[PDB]
């Protein structure tokens, strides 16, 4: 029962642009995605579940870094600012995985735990 | 002053700032100048770095109060504002930067499963 504001919140947390979420998750125009965030139309079940699954991936990514911190390591995390460079290192990923990687790396940098390269 | 261009972009995005908002309020520069700081074309100014680190500290303070409610077994209802003026009505001594920080905190706890958004 994700609301319009909850969709927007998770989309922003995952560092997706509207156009990226619209193209790949919604398979709709950016305008149609904006309508789900504005509440003009209900958030589709399939879109809700996909946002939740992507959040679960992000959690798995964080649990792994947490173990490195528990070991005393100060990780050097890749912050890719070029999609093509992310994809060259992750040939089976796409723009969604790129944004997830940014969200995770930014969290640990901002918390003071990791350095970005 | 050791924050890199990518670290600036990372913290700016984590705090949910649009480039234009960061440029106007934190940089006191054009959007293009802020973009140059994120792309590496121009060095990140020391004072910009410090304001961004200070904003991260503000965000930590905001999260610590929520964490204490979670420790009591509460499921908070966090306000997710999607209009600046509605945030300001409840937070009249704040600005657009404060609004974005409030979104970043509410979105974190909602996405991690601990809070509902209203
Ligand atoms: Cl609304
Ligand atoms: Cl609140
Ligand atoms: Mg691989
Ligand atoms: Mg450093
Ligand atoms: Mg206040
Ligand atoms: Mg609910």
PDB file of C-alpha atoms and ligand atoms in Angstrom:
ATOM      1  CA  UNK A   1       0.000   0.000   0.000  1.00  0.00           C
ATOM      2  CA  UNK A   2       2.747   2.398  -1.056  1.00  0.00           C
ATOM      3  CA  UNK A   3       1.488   5.988  -1.309  1.00  0.00           C
ATOM      4  CA  UNK A   4       2.466   8.562  -3.948  1.00  0.00           C
ATOM      5  CA  UNK A   5       4.879  10.139  -1.466  1.00  0.00           C
ATOM      6  CA  UNK A   6       6.358   6.791  -0.498  1.00  0.00           C
ATOM      7  CA  UNK A   7       7.074   6.035  -4.172  1.00  0.00           C
ATOM      8  CA  UNK A   8       8.817   9.386  -4.526  1.00  0.00           C
ATOM      9  CA  UNK A   9      10.771   8.816  -1.301  1.00  0.00           C
ATOM     10  CA  UNK A  10      12.134   5.421  -2.332  1.00  0.00           C
ATOM     11  CA  UNK A  11      12.857   6.595  -5.881  1.00  0.00           C
ATOM     12  CA  UNK A  12      14.920   9.512  -4.530  1.00  0.00           C
ATOM     13  CA  UNK A  13      16.645   7.358  -1.917  1.00  0.00           C
ATOM     14  CA  UNK A  14      17.774   4.954  -4.660  1.00  0.00           C
ATOM     15  CA  UNK A  15      19.149   7.996  -6.543  1.00  0.00           C
ATOM     16  CA  UNK A  16      17.029   7.381  -9.635  1.00  0.00           C
ATOM     17  CA  UNK A  17      16.063  10.220 -11.951  1.00  0.00           C
ATOM     18  CA  UNK A  18      12.382  10.231 -12.889  1.00  0.00           C
ATOM     19  CA  UNK A  19      13.283   9.476 -16.494  1.00  0.00           C
ATOM     20  CA  UNK A  20      15.363   6.439 -15.461  1.00  0.00           C
ATOM     21  CA  UNK A  21      12.657   4.993 -13.216  1.00  0.00           C
ATOM     22  CA  UNK A  22      10.029   5.698 -15.889  1.00  0.00           C
ATOM     23  CA  UNK A  23      11.968   3.971 -18.672  1.00  0.00           C
ATOM     24  CA  UNK A  24      13.184   0.879 -16.850  1.00  0.00           C
ATOM     25  CA  UNK A  25      10.876   0.242 -13.889  1.00  0.00           C
ATOM     26  CA  UNK A  26       7.561   1.683 -15.044  1.00  0.00           C
ATOM     27  CA  UNK A  27       8.065   1.123 -18.788  1.00  0.00           C
ATOM     28  CA  UNK A  28       6.124   4.411 -19.152  1.00  0.00           C
ATOM     29  CA  UNK A  29       6.761   8.051 -20.020  1.00  0.00           C
ATOM     30  CA  UNK A  30       8.311  10.363 -17.451  1.00  0.00           C
ATOM     31  CA  UNK A  31       4.968  12.171 -17.255  1.00  0.00           C
ATOM     32  CA  UNK A  32       3.224   8.904 -16.305  1.00  0.00           C
ATOM     33  CA  UNK A  33       5.785   8.300 -13.543  1.00  0.00           C
ATOM     34  CA  UNK A  34       5.267  11.860 -12.297  1.00  0.00           C
ATOM     35  CA  UNK A  35       1.555  11.086 -12.075  1.00  0.00           C
ATOM     36  CA  UNK A  36       2.283   8.169  -9.734  1.00  0.00           C
ATOM     37  CA  UNK A  37       4.380  10.471  -7.552  1.00  0.00           C
ATOM     38  CA  UNK A  38       1.712  13.202  -7.637  1.00  0.00           C
ATOM     39  CA  UNK A  39      -1.159  10.826  -6.839  1.00  0.00           C
ATOM     40  CA  UNK A  40      -3.102  11.337 -10.060  1.00  0.00           C
ATOM     41  CA  UNK A  41      -2.975   7.547 -10.598  1.00  0.00           C
ATOM     42  CA  UNK A  42      -2.390   4.697  -8.176  1.00  0.00           C
ATOM     43  CA  UNK A  43       1.072   3.161  -7.935  1.00  0.00           C
ATOM     44  CA  UNK A  44       0.902  -0.157  -9.865  1.00  0.00           C
ATOM     45  CA  UNK A  45       1.429  -3.338  -7.847  1.00  0.00           C
ATOM     46  CA  UNK A  46       4.311  -4.425 -10.084  1.00  0.00           C
ATOM     47  CA  UNK A  47       6.096  -1.080  -9.691  1.00  0.00           C
ATOM     48  CA  UNK A  48       5.667  -1.153  -5.906  1.00  0.00           C
ATOM     49  CA  UNK A  49       7.138  -4.664  -5.675  1.00  0.00           C
ATOM     50  CA  UNK A  50      10.054  -3.708  -7.929  1.00  0.00           C
ATOM     51  CA  UNK A  51      10.906  -0.704  -5.768  1.00  0.00           C
ATOM     52  CA  UNK A  52      10.816  -2.957  -2.700  1.00  0.00           C
ATOM     53  CA  UNK A  53      13.071  -5.532  -4.382  1.00  0.00           C
ATOM     54  CA  UNK A  54      15.596  -2.831  -5.288  1.00  0.00           C
ATOM     55  CA  UNK A  55      15.602  -1.633  -1.686  1.00  0.00           C
ATOM     56  CA  UNK A  56      16.362  -5.221  -0.623  1.00  0.00           C
ATOM     57  CA  UNK A  57      19.385  -5.301  -2.952  1.00  0.00           C
ATOM     58  CA  UNK A  58      20.651  -2.049  -1.441  1.00  0.00           C
ATOM     59  CA  UNK A  59      20.391  -3.601   2.035  1.00  0.00           C
ATOM     60  CA  UNK A  60      22.433  -6.615   0.913  1.00  0.00           C
ATOM     61  CA  UNK A  61      25.104  -4.273  -0.449  1.00  0.00           C
ATOM     62  CA  UNK A  62      25.263  -2.432   2.879  1.00  0.00           C
ATOM     63  CA  UNK A  63      25.509  -5.590   5.009  1.00  0.00           C
ATOM     64  CA  UNK A  64      28.679  -6.563   3.127  1.00  0.00           C
ATOM     65  CA  UNK A  65      30.333  -3.167   3.668  1.00  0.00           C
ATOM     66  CA  UNK A  66      29.289  -3.284   7.329  1.00  0.00           C
ATOM     67  CA  UNK A  67      31.363  -6.444   7.779  1.00  0.00           C
ATOM     68  CA  UNK A  68      34.431  -4.672   6.378  1.00  0.00           C
ATOM     69  CA  UNK A  69      33.897  -1.810   8.838  1.00  0.00           C
ATOM     70  CA  UNK A  70      33.545  -4.306  11.690  1.00  0.00           C
ATOM     71  CA  UNK A  71      36.988  -5.646  10.627  1.00  0.00           C
ATOM     72  CA  UNK A  72      38.461  -2.151  11.023  1.00  0.00           C
ATOM     73  CA  UNK A  73      38.808  -1.473   7.294  1.00  0.00           C
ATOM     74  CA  UNK A  74      38.213   1.981   5.858  1.00  0.00           C
ATOM     75  CA  UNK A  75      36.886   1.012   2.413  1.00  0.00           C
ATOM     76  CA  UNK A  76      37.766   2.767  -0.821  1.00  0.00           C
ATOM     77  CA  UNK A  77      34.418   2.610  -2.575  1.00  0.00           C
ATOM     78  CA  UNK A  78      33.875   3.340  -6.251  1.00  0.00           C
ATOM     79  CA  UNK A  79      31.602   6.302  -6.865  1.00  0.00           C
ATOM     80  CA  UNK A  80      30.993   6.083 -10.582  1.00  0.00           C
ATOM     81  CA  UNK A  81      29.952   9.420 -12.038  1.00  0.00           C
ATOM     82  CA  UNK A  82      29.802   8.019 -15.589  1.00  0.00           C
ATOM     83  CA  UNK A  83      27.232   5.320 -16.411  1.00  0.00           C
ATOM     84  CA  UNK A  84      29.411   3.845 -19.166  1.00  0.00           C
ATOM     85  CA  UNK A  85      32.307   3.382 -16.726  1.00  0.00           C
ATOM     86  CA  UNK A  86      30.025   1.603 -14.248  1.00  0.00           C
ATOM     87  CA  UNK A  87      28.768  -0.644 -17.054  1.00  0.00           C
ATOM     88  CA  UNK A  88      32.258  -1.468 -18.317  1.00  0.00           C
ATOM     89  CA  UNK A  89      32.963  -2.868 -14.832  1.00  0.00           C
ATOM     90  CA  UNK A  90      29.478  -4.441 -14.529  1.00  0.00           C
ATOM     91  CA  UNK A  91      28.583  -5.640 -18.036  1.00  0.00           C
ATOM     92  CA  UNK A  92      25.330  -7.331 -16.930  1.00  0.00           C
ATOM     93  CA  UNK A  93      23.985  -4.329 -14.989  1.00  0.00           C
ATOM     94  CA  UNK A  94      22.221  -1.175 -16.167  1.00  0.00           C
ATOM     95  CA  UNK A  95      21.380   2.362 -15.066  1.00  0.00           C
ATOM     96  CA  UNK A  96      19.404   1.047 -12.059  1.00  0.00           C
ATOM     97  CA  UNK A  97      22.408  -0.775 -10.577  1.00  0.00           C
ATOM     98  CA  UNK A  98      24.522   2.306 -11.245  1.00  0.00           C
ATOM     99  CA  UNK A  99      22.207   4.471  -9.138  1.00  0.00           C
ATOM    100  CA  UNK A 100      22.050   1.850  -6.374  1.00  0.00           C
ATOM    101  CA  UNK A 101      25.857   1.822  -6.265  1.00  0.00           C
ATOM    102  CA  UNK A 102      25.870   5.605  -5.904  1.00  0.00           C
ATOM    103  CA  UNK A 103      23.334   5.525  -3.111  1.00  0.00           C
ATOM    104  CA  UNK A 104      25.361   2.998  -1.126  1.00  0.00           C
ATOM    105  CA  UNK A 105      28.716   4.665  -1.676  1.00  0.00           C
ATOM    106  CA  UNK A 106      27.299   8.103  -0.847  1.00  0.00           C
ATOM    107  CA  UNK A 107      25.834   6.798   2.420  1.00  0.00           C
ATOM    108  CA  UNK A 108      29.150   5.445   3.694  1.00  0.00           C
ATOM    109  CA  UNK A 109      31.090   8.527   2.567  1.00  0.00           C
ATOM    110  CA  UNK A 110      28.622  10.914   4.204  1.00  0.00           C
ATOM    111  CA  UNK A 111      28.669   8.868   7.449  1.00  0.00           C
ATOM    112  CA  UNK A 112      32.456   9.289   7.465  1.00  0.00           C
ATOM    113  CA  UNK A 113      33.229   5.586   6.990  1.00  0.00           C
ATOM    114  CA  UNK A 114      34.528   5.345   3.418  1.00  0.00           C
ATOM    115  CA  UNK A 115      36.590   7.272   0.893  1.00  0.00           C
ATOM    116  CA  UNK A 116      35.310   7.531  -2.690  1.00  0.00           C
ATOM    117  CA  UNK A 117      37.349   6.978  -5.849  1.00  0.00           C
TER     118      UNK A 117
ATOM    119  CA  UNK B   1      40.191  20.867   1.863  1.00  0.00           C
ATOM    120  CA  UNK B   2      40.445  17.270   0.633  1.00  0.00           C
ATOM    121  CA  UNK B   3      36.855  16.498  -0.464  1.00  0.00           C
ATOM    122  CA  UNK B   4      36.998  15.243  -4.052  1.00  0.00           C
ATOM    123  CA  UNK B   5      34.620  16.209  -6.864  1.00  0.00           C
ATOM    124  CA  UNK B   6      32.932  12.813  -6.584  1.00  0.00           C
ATOM    125  CA  UNK B   7      32.631  13.091  -2.815  1.00  0.00           C
ATOM    126  CA  UNK B   8      30.927  16.467  -3.242  1.00  0.00           C
ATOM    127  CA  UNK B   9      28.435  14.984  -5.690  1.00  0.00           C
ATOM    128  CA  UNK B  10      27.873  12.018  -3.357  1.00  0.00           C
ATOM    129  CA  UNK B  11      27.008  14.105  -0.321  1.00  0.00           C
ATOM    130  CA  UNK B  12      24.952  16.578  -2.404  1.00  0.00           C
ATOM    131  CA  UNK B  13      22.851  13.688  -3.774  1.00  0.00           C
ATOM    132  CA  UNK B  14      22.617  11.938  -0.380  1.00  0.00           C
ATOM    133  CA  UNK B  15      21.194  15.131   1.129  1.00  0.00           C
ATOM    134  CA  UNK B  16      18.684  15.207  -1.785  1.00  0.00           C
ATOM    135  CA  UNK B  17      19.752  18.657  -2.993  1.00  0.00           C
ATOM    136  CA  UNK B  18      19.108  19.662  -6.574  1.00  0.00           C
ATOM    137  CA  UNK B  19      22.206  21.192  -8.179  1.00  0.00           C
ATOM    138  CA  UNK B  20      20.419  24.555  -8.465  1.00  0.00           C
ATOM    139  CA  UNK B  21      19.572  24.574  -4.732  1.00  0.00           C
ATOM    140  CA  UNK B  22      23.100  23.691  -3.692  1.00  0.00           C
ATOM    141  CA  UNK B  23      24.521  26.319  -6.045  1.00  0.00           C
ATOM    142  CA  UNK B  24      22.237  29.115  -4.846  1.00  0.00           C
ATOM    143  CA  UNK B  25      22.446  28.466  -1.112  1.00  0.00           C
ATOM    144  CA  UNK B  26      25.676  26.623  -0.334  1.00  0.00           C
ATOM    145  CA  UNK B  27      27.939  27.686  -3.182  1.00  0.00           C
ATOM    146  CA  UNK B  28      26.471  31.155  -3.719  1.00  0.00           C
ATOM    147  CA  UNK B  29      27.422  30.544  -7.361  1.00  0.00           C
ATOM    148  CA  UNK B  30      25.795  29.703 -10.669  1.00  0.00           C
ATOM    149  CA  UNK B  31      24.613  26.168 -11.338  1.00  0.00           C
ATOM    150  CA  UNK B  32      27.433  25.817 -13.871  1.00  0.00           C
ATOM    151  CA  UNK B  33      30.053  26.609 -11.211  1.00  0.00           C
ATOM    152  CA  UNK B  34      28.576  23.932  -8.931  1.00  0.00           C
ATOM    153  CA  UNK B  35      28.588  21.481 -11.849  1.00  0.00           C
ATOM    154  CA  UNK B  36      32.285  22.215 -12.365  1.00  0.00           C
ATOM    155  CA  UNK B  37      32.954  21.369  -8.711  1.00  0.00           C
ATOM    156  CA  UNK B  38      31.186  18.029  -9.187  1.00  0.00           C
ATOM    157  CA  UNK B  39      32.845  17.255 -12.540  1.00  0.00           C
ATOM    158  CA  UNK B  40      36.378  18.125 -11.373  1.00  0.00           C
ATOM    159  CA  UNK B  41      36.797  21.057 -13.746  1.00  0.00           C
ATOM    160  CA  UNK B  42      37.173  23.452 -10.776  1.00  0.00           C
ATOM    161  CA  UNK B  43      38.379  22.740  -7.255  1.00  0.00           C
ATOM    162  CA  UNK B  44      35.851  22.383  -4.431  1.00  0.00           C
ATOM    163  CA  UNK B  45      36.155  25.491  -2.190  1.00  0.00           C
ATOM    164  CA  UNK B  46      37.097  24.891   1.453  1.00  0.00           C
ATOM    165  CA  UNK B  47      34.007  26.726   2.721  1.00  0.00           C
ATOM    166  CA  UNK B  48      31.654  24.672   0.522  1.00  0.00           C
ATOM    167  CA  UNK B  49      33.251  21.483   1.814  1.00  0.00           C
ATOM    168  CA  UNK B  50      32.715  22.595   5.401  1.00  0.00           C
ATOM    169  CA  UNK B  51      29.064  23.580   4.886  1.00  0.00           C
ATOM    170  CA  UNK B  52      28.338  20.192   3.341  1.00  0.00           C
ATOM    171  CA  UNK B  53      30.003  18.394   6.264  1.00  0.00           C
ATOM    172  CA  UNK B  54      28.007  20.602   8.644  1.00  0.00           C
ATOM    173  CA  UNK B  55      24.804  19.612   6.829  1.00  0.00           C
ATOM    174  CA  UNK B  56      25.703  15.945   7.299  1.00  0.00           C
ATOM    175  CA  UNK B  57      26.002  16.689  11.030  1.00  0.00           C
ATOM    176  CA  UNK B  58      22.552  18.317  11.027  1.00  0.00           C
ATOM    177  CA  UNK B  59      21.163  15.202   9.347  1.00  0.00           C
ATOM    178  CA  UNK B  60      22.797  12.985  11.994  1.00  0.00           C
ATOM    179  CA  UNK B  61      21.093  15.005  14.739  1.00  0.00           C
ATOM    180  CA  UNK B  62      17.753  14.535  12.960  1.00  0.00           C
ATOM    181  CA  UNK B  63      18.299  10.752  12.767  1.00  0.00           C
ATOM    182  CA  UNK B  64      19.340  10.308  16.401  1.00  0.00           C
ATOM    183  CA  UNK B  65      15.916  11.385  17.695  1.00  0.00           C
ATOM    184  CA  UNK B  66      14.189   8.889  15.386  1.00  0.00           C
ATOM    185  CA  UNK B  67      16.597   6.128  16.437  1.00  0.00           C
ATOM    186  CA  UNK B  68      15.559   6.620  20.067  1.00  0.00           C
ATOM    187  CA  UNK B  69      11.896   6.133  19.121  1.00  0.00           C
ATOM    188  CA  UNK B  70      12.788   2.956  17.228  1.00  0.00           C
ATOM    189  CA  UNK B  71      14.629   1.706  20.307  1.00  0.00           C
ATOM    190  CA  UNK B  72      11.326   2.035  22.212  1.00  0.00           C
ATOM    191  CA  UNK B  73       9.569  -0.125  19.625  1.00  0.00           C
ATOM    192  CA  UNK B  74       7.765   2.756  17.934  1.00  0.00           C
ATOM    193  CA  UNK B  75       6.925   2.851  14.228  1.00  0.00           C
ATOM    194  CA  UNK B  76       7.188   6.607  13.571  1.00  0.00           C
ATOM    195  CA  UNK B  77       5.008   8.443  11.086  1.00  0.00           C
ATOM    196  CA  UNK B  78       7.515  10.762   9.406  1.00  0.00           C
ATOM    197  CA  UNK B  79       6.367  13.776   7.417  1.00  0.00           C
ATOM    198  CA  UNK B  80       7.459  13.607   3.783  1.00  0.00           C
ATOM    199  CA  UNK B  81       6.815  17.058   2.357  1.00  0.00           C
ATOM    200  CA  UNK B  82       6.553  17.396  -1.406  1.00  0.00           C
ATOM    201  CA  UNK B  83       6.084  21.174  -1.413  1.00  0.00           C
ATOM    202  CA  UNK B  84       8.604  23.567   0.098  1.00  0.00           C
ATOM    203  CA  UNK B  85       5.962  25.929   1.495  1.00  0.00           C
ATOM    204  CA  UNK B  86       4.295  23.053   3.355  1.00  0.00           C
ATOM    205  CA  UNK B  87       7.602  22.112   4.970  1.00  0.00           C
ATOM    206  CA  UNK B  88       8.227  25.777   5.860  1.00  0.00           C
ATOM    207  CA  UNK B  89       4.815  26.192   7.480  1.00  0.00           C
ATOM    208  CA  UNK B  90       5.916  23.578  10.067  1.00  0.00           C
ATOM    209  CA  UNK B  91       9.602  24.647  10.115  1.00  0.00           C
ATOM    210  CA  UNK B  92       9.501  28.435   9.672  1.00  0.00           C
ATOM    211  CA  UNK B  93      13.163  29.070  10.595  1.00  0.00           C
ATOM    212  CA  UNK B  94      14.453  26.756   7.808  1.00  0.00           C
ATOM    213  CA  UNK B  95      15.051  26.918   4.050  1.00  0.00           C
ATOM    214  CA  UNK B  96      15.064  24.695   0.957  1.00  0.00           C
ATOM    215  CA  UNK B  97      18.175  22.900   2.249  1.00  0.00           C
ATOM    216  CA  UNK B  98      16.320  21.974   5.427  1.00  0.00           C
ATOM    217  CA  UNK B  99      13.427  20.668   3.348  1.00  0.00           C
ATOM    218  CA  UNK B 100      15.713  18.372   1.379  1.00  0.00           C
ATOM    219  CA  UNK B 101      17.378  17.095   4.555  1.00  0.00           C
ATOM    220  CA  UNK B 102      13.933  16.256   5.937  1.00  0.00           C
ATOM    221  CA  UNK B 103      13.147  14.305   2.761  1.00  0.00           C
ATOM    222  CA  UNK B 104      16.433  12.415   2.940  1.00  0.00           C
ATOM    223  CA  UNK B 105      15.795  11.348   6.548  1.00  0.00           C
ATOM    224  CA  UNK B 106      12.149  10.380   6.007  1.00  0.00           C
ATOM    225  CA  UNK B 107      12.996   8.462   2.832  1.00  0.00           C
ATOM    226  CA  UNK B 108      15.795   6.559   4.597  1.00  0.00           C
ATOM    227  CA  UNK B 109      13.627   5.232   7.431  1.00  0.00           C
ATOM    228  CA  UNK B 110      10.718   4.449   5.113  1.00  0.00           C
ATOM    229  CA  UNK B 111      12.892   2.597   2.627  1.00  0.00           C
ATOM    230  CA  UNK B 112      14.676   0.615   5.348  1.00  0.00           C
ATOM    231  CA  UNK B 113      11.272  -0.494   6.668  1.00  0.00           C
ATOM    232  CA  UNK B 114      11.150   1.333  10.004  1.00  0.00           C
ATOM    233  CA  UNK B 115       8.697   4.196   9.407  1.00  0.00           C
ATOM    234  CA  UNK B 116       5.530   5.149   7.565  1.00  0.00           C
ATOM    235  CA  UNK B 117       5.358   8.430   5.645  1.00  0.00           C
ATOM    236  CA  UNK B 118       2.594  10.996   5.900  1.00  0.00           C
TER     237      UNK B 118
HETATM  238 CL1  LIG C   1       0.538  14.464  -1.793  1.00  0.00          CL
HETATM  239 CL1  LIG C   2       8.294  14.053  11.082  1.00  0.00          CL
HETATM  240 MG1  LIG C   3      30.374  -8.614 -12.285  1.00  0.00          MG
HETATM  241 MG1  LIG C   4      39.301  11.977   2.083  1.00  0.00          MG
HETATM  242 MG1  LIG C   5      13.847  23.204  13.309  1.00  0.00          MG
HETATM  243 MG1  LIG C   6       1.705   2.399   4.801  1.00  0.00          MG
END
